[PDB]
């Protein structure tokens with residue numbers, strides 16, 4: 064079937080917040096990447112893993128995956144930073160509805176308040192003075208029919 | 211080769227602690243899911259990933275995977291929450307014996323003290339006012 | 355091909371990661387070495403390191419080094435408040451042949467601080483038992 068990895072090496076200032084008002088809309092957080100994938104197989108799943116290096120002053124990080132054409136996220140996850148960079152992750156298994164190429168958008172933002180930096184320290188400076196890499200991968204798998 | 215994903219969306223208050231006296235028993239934590247998988251290949255392994263949204267007042271979260279029929283966990287992992295929700299994960303490779311369906315239970319609880327809420331804020335409220343989703347997946351693979 | 359490499363020892367990771375050593379081989383403490391051989395050409399390895407780590411309040415750094423290189427090919431970040439927490443590295447590396455290749459995983463403090471792997475910050479067993487961190491290599495064919 065399919066495997067696709069999408070590295071994200073850009074630094075992103077995510078000043079877009081996630082709130083109870085915007086969480087089920089398209090307005091929450093800040094987009095950090097877009098990814099187009101095509102299932103090879105009927106009846107398959109995409110196992111999606113976003114593993115994002117992020118910093119913020121003490122608080123929560125929200126990640127939201129949006130299928131282009133939908134009006135709200137199809138998966139939402141949560142991370143944390145104390146001030147120092149931490150891996151913030153989203154895992155989901157999406158049931159595929161055909162063989163049409165589909166574009167997903169990943170958005171990142173503070174839980175209710177605060178600015179989140181992706182691939183940087185909490186002030187936007189390079190972590191350890193270098194370029195860092197976050198990753199979003201899509202792995203197509205066939206789920207087992209359980210007897 | 212078998213694959214299955216098991217979403218978990220209930221808000222669950224995990225009052226069961228993990229302690230040095232219960233960690234090698236079936237009594238630690240609070241069960242948050244139970245899953246039955248069937249290997250298609252003999253001598254395979256399951257790559258298991260539990261990714262659980264959890265909150266607790268400042269402290270450690272423990273995750274334990276228990277194979278039904280065993281007397282203690284076959285895998286143990288650790289997570290953290292400051293009070294705000296955070297993903298707490300267990301990732302392991304588990305050996306399969308034969309082709310019969312096998313049932314696994316996932317337990318979550320505080321490291322030695324504290325209450326852990328799964329899929330909720332530390333007071334049991336909905337995170338961002340919505341239903342939230344945790345996942346446990348099993349991917350069958352042939353080891354080298 | 356799938357290969358899993360469990361790491362069970364209690365390891366004091368006293369080697370720091372600093373701006374001066376991050377792009378060298380000198381950062382961190384090696385916690386494991388893994389030799390894998392791609393079965394298919396054009397393939398990638400999906401690498402997942404999930405390491406139980408503790409330190410006094412602060413950042414944990416993880417670096418994967420491929421034998422022959424002068425610096426890490428993947429770097430990730432974790433956190434501990436003083437109690438053990440899973441610190442992870444995820445990456446996809448492109449395979450270049452069908453010959454065995456050796457990788458090294460190093461863990462250390464972000465700029466300062468001792469990190470313990472598979473242990474409390476004083477080197478005691480967590481919950482009084484042996485604990486397990488894992489590094490796996492799953493060979494897959496890309497698009």
Ligand SMILES: [K+]
Nearest residue numbers: 145291292435
């Ligand atoms: K903290």
